[model samples]
Target: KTLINRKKLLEMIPLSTRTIYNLEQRGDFPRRIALTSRNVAWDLSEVEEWIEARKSS
Candidate 1:
């Protein structure tokens, strides 16, 4: 279960921060997990699957 930060995630999705946040809110994307007081990350597996699903369809 690897975790990825926003910068890395953006590279994979190629979407604006606003758009990704909106998608997250809509439950269309994986939600980020709080790692610390000022840190957060998303599951790599979740984002990988999400991208594959989008690409295949």
Candidate 2:
């Protein structure tokens, strides 16, 4: 029921935009899914899942 957009992501994660983009290139982070050419969002489930996986690791 919630979406994590770029701004929200920035507020949630201690990551710079460049770093988030960089991680995507390295296959190390969940990349933003394009909602439109002007809008993009990360998966809510995926982001939470990622954080959980990281904690377990």
Candidate 3:
């Protein structure tokens, strides 16, 4: 269960920070996990599956 930070996420996904935020707000993307008051991360598996689903559809 690897987790990725925002910087790594940006490199993996071809969208802007604003776009990712918007998609998350709309429930179209995986929600980030709050690691601390100032840190957040996303599940690597979830992100990879999301990309796979998007590519296949």
Candidate 4:
């Protein structure tokens, strides 16, 4: 699966960063991957599916 960084992720997702983090805390968002001590990324497919789910509902 392709990975996306926070900047790219925020651009594609309409929600604010805070809201996205909250969703993650509540298990409503996809979990991210740890690339290093201070770097992280998310699954592109997971993000696409999340958007699809939001629209379908």
In terms of TM-score, the best-performing candidate is: 3
* lDDT (10s digit) by residue, model 3, range 1-57: 799999999999989999999999999899999999899999999999999989899
Over the stretch 1-57, how does candidate 2's per-residue lDDT look in tens digits? 667888888887899999989988998888788888999999888888878888999
Which numbered prediction scores highest in lDDT against the true structure? 3
Ranking the candidates on lDDT from highest down gives 3, 1, 4, 2
Q: State model 3's lDDT.
A: 0.95
At residue 51, what lDDT does model 2 achieve? 82
Whole-structure CA lDDT of model 4 = 0.92
- TM-score of each candidate structure, all chains considered together: 0.88, 0.85, 0.94, 0.90
**Candidate 4 TM-score, C-alpha based:** 0.90
Worst 10 residues of 2 by lDDT: 1-10
**Stretches of candidate 1 exceeding 4 Å from the true structure:** none
Model 2 alpha-carbon drift over 4 Å, by segment: none
User: What C-alpha lDDT does candidate 2 achieve relative to the native structure?
Assistant: 0.86
RMSD of 3: 0.7
After TM-score superposition, the amount by which residue 37's alpha carbon in candidate 1 deviates from its true location, in angstroms, is: 3.5
